[PDB]
């Protein structure tokens, strides 16, 4: 057994973290007070769920998690929320004033003064690990903390834990649920400084989650609670292999081995199905072929883009529920004959399939309906470069006028870091094009 530590940075990271650990607890039968009646080893054990939960002598199962925010209002929700008992105070770190959607403020001004404290609290969690795998870092692109402080934390983590894997869950900015005009700046600034420190990053575009909530859940105006409960289902599907008995993606290293053949191109596309409204009278349960086929529909991708016009470098199918290998292979065959699935010539054309028999857990009172089977597809497509193109374009429009730049230079950042970060993205877009286009 090898432990994984989850780090949640900024409002997005913290609120998504709260929704994930709520789901984790329901999946492992852990109660809000930390007790776990099904754990017959009191005060210890090296089970699969122990990669995410430690144990006290009293039988409390404590997440291996740290929450960080430069302002306390969001993390105070955790301190007084339903699962307040799960965490002890050392795990929840809050400053006094936020980064004001200013990457430079989170990375330099405020980050410099709290970074050593955060590393010290992470070191405490690490000291409880007999074989730490690495870190799962949740954060937004657009926020000053999620963007600025995250990149600083990643640099230090590579220094203190050189041989440890680091995965990201990043929230890509979408104006429909955004109110910061400078988020393209922050997104590109944090991608440039985090790129060499992240082994694999799962980008979630709020625009996509928003429309899935309106289209499939019939929510006219989705809230962060709606968005986050859907995001935590996808996160759960991705981390299940680390928390349950299995043989695929059993440790953080396997994520890179199976999804990232080239280091800079470490942004897999996530596709999830089915998302069924709980308010529905009663939905017809979808088959293995139907939920698998849905993995190649743009409507259920975590980032709106067209994989038909890219190339695949890897493809993982993660099933949960009533699924046997026979049905999976049958659906895969039927999809190759109808779909446009082009692989890069230096990668095998195939799929790694994992199946967990326990069907997805739904949060009581949530929006999602109980389904007998679900799948999450992780594919490394060049098509996800459309998101970099969109983002880099908005960057170019503002930076050509130096709009808002003074806010960053005022916090100690040099203007040349803008162009330096932009040139790295231009090179990143070039990498994708050399791999996908002919």
């Amino acid at each position: 057994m090898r432990e994984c530590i989850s780090i949640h940075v900024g409002q997005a990271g913290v609120q998504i973290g709260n929704a994930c650990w709520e789901l984790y607890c329901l999946e492992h039968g852990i109660q809000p007070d930390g007790q776990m009646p099904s754990d017959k080893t009191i005060g210890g054990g090296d089970d699969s769920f122990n990669t995410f939960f430690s144990e006290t002598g009293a039988g409390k199962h404590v997440p291996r998690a740290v929450f960080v925010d430069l302002e306390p209002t969001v993390i105070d929700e955790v301190r007084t929320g339903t699962y307040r008992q799960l965490f002890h105070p050392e795990q929840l770190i809050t400053g006094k004033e936020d980064a004001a959607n200013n990457y430079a403020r989170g990375h330099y001004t405020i980050g410099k003064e709290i970074i050593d404290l955060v590393l010290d609290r992470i070191r405490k969690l690490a000291d409880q690990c007999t074989g730490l795998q690495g870190f799962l870092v949740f954060h937004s692109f657009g926020g000053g903390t999620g963007s600025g402080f995250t990149s600083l934390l990643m640099e230090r983590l590579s220094v203190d834990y050189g041989k440890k894997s680091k995965l990201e869950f990043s929230i890509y900015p979408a104006p429909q649920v955004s109110t910061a005009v400078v988020e393209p700046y922050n997104s590109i600034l944090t991608t440039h400084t985090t790129l060499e420190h992240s082994d694999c990053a799962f980008m979630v575009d709020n625009e996509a989650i928003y429309d899935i909530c309106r289209r499939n859940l019939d929510i006219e105006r989705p809230t962060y609670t709606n968005l986050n409960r859907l995001i935590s289902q996808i996160v759960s599907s991705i981390t299940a292999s680390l928390r349950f008995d299995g043989a695929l993606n059993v440790d953080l290293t396997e994520f890179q081995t199976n999804l990232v053949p080239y280091p800079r191109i470490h942004f897999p596309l996530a596709t999830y199905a089915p998302v069924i409204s709980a308010e529905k009278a009663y939905h017809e349960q979808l088959s293995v072929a139907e939920i698998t086929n849905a993995c190649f529909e743009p409507a259920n991708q975590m980032v709106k883009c067209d994989p038909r016009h890219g190339k695949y470098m890897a493809c993982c199918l993660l099933y949960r529920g009533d699924v046997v290998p026979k049905d999976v292979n049958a659906a895969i065959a039927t999809i190759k004959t109808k779909r446009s699935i082009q692989f890069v010539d230096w990668c095998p054309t195939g799929f790694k399939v994992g199946i967990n028999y326990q069907p997805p857990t739904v949060v009581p009172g949530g929006d999602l309906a109980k389904v007998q089977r679900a799948v999450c597809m992780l594919s490394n497509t060049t098509a996800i470069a459309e998101a970099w193109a969109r983002l880099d374009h908005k960057f170019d429009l503002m930076y050509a006028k130096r709009a808002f730049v003074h806010w960053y230079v005022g916090e100690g950042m040099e203007e040349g870091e803008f162009s330096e970060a932009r040139e790295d993205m231009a090179a990143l877009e070039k990498d994708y094009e050399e791999v996908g286009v002919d």
């Binding site: 006094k96 200013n102 109110t179 005009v181 503002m398 709009a403 808002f404 806010w407």
Partner: protein, 425 residues
């Protein structure tokens, strides 16, 4: 706990500030004695942003009343909510400033400024985490304009990394007390360009036109004008006084509204503006159409003469948030020629469930438009019509000022106009 320190200076500043505290005190359920009597927890959620909590569950406004005459502040102390203000926070002299910027900034005001800063320092020392400051004042007088900007200069010296915000009433010849108002306004504007992060430009002629033409008030008074300012100040501060994610604090608001440090002068707006056909329900489309209409704006600048760099909208009341997005996206997509295309998604919308007193719903408009250059052009032209003959300068040279300081303020404002002009093309 993101506390804001409020300062009101001079006649105009204290009369508008008084009404401001009257309006929001009612919204938060605070009575004239500081006792809370609301019925919604949303009233106290962010109450400490503007109020201090005293013994006995008393809420005391975090406001400092400043003037070089006692008169106006005696009226406030006798006003409706006069008893709610901390007595030690009345700081006043006896000389007055005679509508003279030099007296407020250099002579009479200098003797009093240190004692005001003592009260400011006291209020800040008890702030868990101070956001910044907001000042209400006019620019055409002597105390609010001259001592007001002197205060800002010294506050920025002692709190260099805090946000400085002002509601500044710009003079107009149509609603004027003295002929020296353009002199006092031109000298102040340069101070504001340097030392404020956000300035809400309120033009007295616009307030007058609205009262006369829209509200159908035959003979508007300063009181009527201040009703509009109260409602506007309450709207633009809803983001700060109630739970919300957009423009939550002063620094985030400035980060999204100010793409260039000197271009931080906003046009505010409010809807509805109805005469006494006042009980009619207002639809979301109507709320949005009027909120962007030039007649509902209070800087007396035609938005069609420039382009919006950024816009912040706040809708108050139980309404179709979906239907709000549609109309907002409709206004932008129907007039995208008045929005700069090099700042993507530069129009942000926030919603608040609690509406203003006596209204089912309303919308407050905050625009950073290059059309605001028309306001500084007017002031500049009036300044120069007099300064070219050195008319009325003796009032200022008599206080130790030199003509050179006027020539520099003149050039400083014409530079500002030129800066807006380069971004309008």
């Amino acid at each position: 706990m993101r506390e804001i320190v409020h300062i009101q200076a001079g006649q105009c500043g204290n009369q508008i500030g008084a009404k401001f505290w009257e309006v929001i005190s009612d919204e938060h359920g605070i009575d004239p004695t500081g006792s809370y009597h609301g019925d919604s927890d949303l009233q106290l959620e962010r109450i400490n942003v503007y109020y201090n909590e005293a013994t006995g569950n008393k809420y005391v406004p975090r406001a400092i009343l400043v003037d070089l005459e006692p008169g106006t502040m005696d009226s406030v102390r006798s006003g409706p909510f006069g008893q709610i203000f901390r007595p030690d926070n009345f700081v006043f002299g006896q000389s007055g400033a005679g509508n003279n910027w030099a007296k407020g900034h250099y002579t009479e005001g200098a003797e009093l400024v240190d004692s005001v800063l003592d009260v400011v320092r006291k209020e800040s020392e008890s702030c868990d985490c101070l956001q910044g400051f907001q000042l209400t004042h006019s620019l055409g007088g002597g105390t609010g304009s001259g001592m007001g900007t002197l205060l800002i200069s010294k506050i920025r010296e002692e709190y260099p990394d805090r946000i400085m915000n002002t509601f500044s009433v710009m003079p107009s010849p149509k609603v004027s007390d003295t002929v020296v108002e353009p002199y006092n306004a031109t000298l102040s504007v340069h101070q504001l360009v340097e030392n404020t992060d956000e300035t809400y430009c309120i033009d007295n002629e616009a307030l007058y036109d609205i009262c006369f033409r829209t509200l159908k008030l035959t003979t508007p008074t300063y009181g009527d004008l201040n009703h509009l300012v109260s409602a506007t100040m309450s709207g633009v501060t809803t983001c700060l006084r109630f739970p919300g994610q957009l423009n939550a604090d002063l620094r985030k608001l400035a980060v999204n509204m100010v793409p260039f440090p000197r271009l931080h002068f906003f046009m505010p707006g409010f809807a509805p503006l109805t005469s006494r056909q006042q009980y009619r329900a207002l639809t979301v489309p109507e709320l949005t159409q009027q909120m962007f209409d030039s007649k509902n704006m209070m800087a007396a600048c035609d938005p069609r003469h420039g382009r919006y760099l950024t816009v912040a909208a706040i809708f108050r009341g139980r309404m179709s948030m979906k239907e709000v997005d549609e109309q907002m996206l409709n206004v932008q997509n129907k007039n995208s020629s008045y929005f700069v295309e090099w700042i993507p998604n530069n129009v942000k919308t926030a919603v608040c469930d609690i509406p203003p007193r006596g209204l089912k719903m309303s919308a407050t408009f905050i625009g950073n438009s290059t059309a605001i250059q028309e306001l500084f052009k007017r002031i500049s032209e009036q300044f120069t019509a007099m300064f070219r003959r050195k008319a009325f300068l003796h009032w200022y040279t008599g206080e130790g000022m030199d003509e050179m300081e006027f020539t520099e303020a003149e050039s400083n404002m014409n530079d500002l106009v030129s800066e807006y002009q380069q971004y309008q093309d």
